[PDB]
Design a protein around this ligand. Structure first.
Ligand SMILES: [Gd]
Ligand SMILES: [Gd]
Ligand SMILES: [Gd]
Ligand SMILES: [Gd]
Ligand SMILES: [Gd]
Lengths: 340, 217, 68
């Protein structure tokens, strides 16, 4: 007869070995070094634009590289590409599922993508104008819902899934070029490194994994949360990233250190974090909570610097433009807003 | 709260689930579960440490199963969409309690009001002093606002009565502080600056709405 | 030659791959968090002064200025 119980121990002893290697470099926390740094002024952003057009809860949004066009996915089975400066709608795309978990904007503006409980990643060419009937490519493959997706360029997109996987696709052939396996639970979100050579992913196993795109494998596995990681975001310089989880904390992970540099939490905060995004300089970490609230964290000092949208319980998702000029918020009341 | 169920992918999953809890054609009634097994099918409720982890598979085979054997009724879909927004407003809509700007006379009173208040209530406190330009116009606006947003508690206090003298010079007056759930949500030094000399309640409102400090739309 | 892989692997097939990865990760040379932190503070401090959401945007320099 066979046995795997022993094989279950080498994993734990190895994990135990990595814990120590990490504990040997944990001399001090980020907050220690930033103790003398002045706290930022109370951050108070104002609504400048209100985007009207959706007829249901906004599930996800994503800014276009020009920091002006943005796409929003809603429970109304629609994808809308907006001109944020004028609040005008540029395109409107009818989807087949109301259950859209994510949407992406190709850095070129030629394409936009989205997917959800359909387990598929649909791509829309905005140039050939597929607004009414066409759907460039439907990326079938995942055996679980499509949690997130981000374009590397026009012929390459990376997706995360509830099937425990992440995949790199060639848009032209429509084949799962690469498959990133390793997580033991549902992949909830991913974040591309600025250089797009690397990317990171958060999952329900409570771990974030750094993956090499060109190479096709996991470089490292971060841990610390005892709960599901629901959101992840790369830091502007590519050497770190932040995570948000069901454990009501956000954590700053440094790649070179292979461990958390800081945690952001407050006793008064008890809901899971489902949205994290950095300001342009990375001084600010904005977190969106399951109760629809959003807190602005001073990434250096680990104290709350402010509140986005006055705790009106109206934020369902958010995003910061590349130029770091504005933040967008989606809402369950069907409206999107832009804050400065 | 614990695990997320309203936002992000978890939100979509929970939304799809609750949807069926109404779609089937009756919910807590006899047309749905009778085994009192569940109010809904749910995944990841009890940790299955067989693999060494607090088991977290949000979508089960039976869930993904329906997904293909599902009859997404367009009509039943729009109905559900309206019902979700209606439900959320309802929960965010708490009774019209107040309707007047209340005068706080001491620092102890200020601390007492934000401290003993329901955590769901927004408190707009106005720190002013007579004669200081802007104050009277703000107080007038507030009285009209307090009467329109009875679920928001508005208050006013002389900088002198705060118990922090010099800290509040006419240079930063009037200052408008907003609290909710025990915490300061906004601090507007020289609020009067945000408006034109002659300002009224609708201006103050447009302003507070834009920071998302006012309920009900 | 990118790697394609279907998820119908056995528990031990997964546990195997787990220990392997864990081994590769063991051989990883790490940097002292201190040196990481100093670099984090550094990058952020010198750029926060220009962060639009940190300092505020001058009204003429705001793309989303009160529309007229
Ligand atoms: Gd501001
Ligand atoms: Gd003035
Ligand atoms: Gd003045
Ligand atoms: Gd009004
Ligand atoms: Gd305005």
């Amino acid at each position: 007869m066979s046995e795997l119980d022993q094989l279950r121990q080498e994993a734990e002893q190895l994990k135990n070995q990595i814990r120590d290697a990490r504990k040997a470099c944990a001399d001090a926390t980020l907050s220690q070094i930033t103790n003398n740094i002045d706290p930022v002024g109370r951050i108070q952003m104002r609504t400048r634009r209100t985007l009207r057009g959706h007829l249901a809860k906004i599930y996800a949004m994503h800014w276009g590289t020009d920091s002006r066009l943005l796409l929003s996915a809603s429970q109304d089975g629609k994808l809308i590409i907006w001109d944020s400066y004028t609040t005008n709608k540029v395109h409107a795309i009818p989807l087949r599922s109301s259950w859209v978990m994510t949407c992406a904007y190709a850095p070129s503006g030629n394409y936009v993508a989205c997917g959800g409980l359909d387990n598929i990643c649909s791509i829309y060419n905005l140039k050939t104008r597929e607004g009414n009937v066409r759907v460039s490519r439907e990326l079938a493959g995942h055996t679980g819902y499509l949690s997130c997706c981000r374009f590397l360029d026009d012929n390459q997109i990376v997706t995360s899934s509830g099937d425990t996987t992440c995949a790199l696709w060639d848009i032209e052939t429509g084949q799962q070029t690469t498959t990133f396996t390793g997580h033991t639970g549902d992949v909830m979100s991913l974040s591309l490194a600025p250089d797009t050579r690397l990317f990171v992913s958060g999952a329900c196993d409570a771990s974030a994994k750094l993956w090499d795109v060109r190479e096709g494998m996991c470089r490292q596995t971060f841990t610390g949360h005892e709960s599901d990681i629901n959101a992840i975001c790369f830091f502007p310089n590519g050497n770190a990233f932040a995570t948000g989880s069901d454990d009501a904390t956000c954590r700053l992970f440094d790649l070179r250190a292979d461990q958390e540099l800081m945690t952001y939490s407050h006793d008064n905060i008890i809901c899971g974090i489902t949205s994290v995004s950095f300001s342009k300089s990375g001084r600010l970490l904005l977190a969106g909570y399951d109760d629809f609230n959003c807190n602005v964290w001073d990434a250096l000092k680990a104290d709350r610097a402010g509140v986005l949208a006055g705790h009106d319980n109206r934020v369902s998702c958010l995003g910061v433009t590349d130029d770091g000029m504005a933040v967008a918020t989606g809402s369950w009341d069907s409206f999107l807003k832009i804050w400065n | 709260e614990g695990q997320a169920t309203h936002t992000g992918p978890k939100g979509v999953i929970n939304d799809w689930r609750k949807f069926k809890l109404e779609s089937e054609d009756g919910d807590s009634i006899p047309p749905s579960k009778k085994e009192i097994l569940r109010q809904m099918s749910s995944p990841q409720s009890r940790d299955d440490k067989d693999s060494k982890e607090r088991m977290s598979r949000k979508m089960s085979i039976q869930e993904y199963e329906l997904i293909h054997q599902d009859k997404e009724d367009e009509g039943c879909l729009r109905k559900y969409r309206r019902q979700c927004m209606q439900d959320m407003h309802q929960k965010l809509s708490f009774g019209p309690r107040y309707g007047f700007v209340y005068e706080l006379e001491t620092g102890e009173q200020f601390l007492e009001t934000i401290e003993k208040e329901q955590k769901v209530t927004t408190i707009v406190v106005n720190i002013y002093e007579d004669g200081v330009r802007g104050c009277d116009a703000l107080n007038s606006s507030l009285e009209c606002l307090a009467a329109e947003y009875p679920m928001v508690k508005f208050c006013k206090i002389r900088a002198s009565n705060t118990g922090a003298g010099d800290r509040f010079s006419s240079d930063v007056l009037p200052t408008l502080l907003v609290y909710k759930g025990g915490e300061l949500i906004s601090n507007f030094i020289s609020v009067a600056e945000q408006f034109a000399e002659d300002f009224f309640a609708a201006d103050v409102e447009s302003f507070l709405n834009e920071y998302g400090l006012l309920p009900e739309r | 030659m990118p790697v394609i892989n279907i998820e119908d692997l056995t528990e031990k097939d997964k546990l195997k791959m787990e220990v392997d990865q864990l081994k590769k990760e063991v051989t990883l040379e790490r940097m002292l968090v201190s040196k990481c932190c100093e670099e984090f503070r550094d990058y952020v401090e010198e750029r926060s002064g220009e962060d639009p959401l940190v300092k505020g945007i001058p009204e003429d320099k705001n793309p989303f200025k009160e529309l007229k």
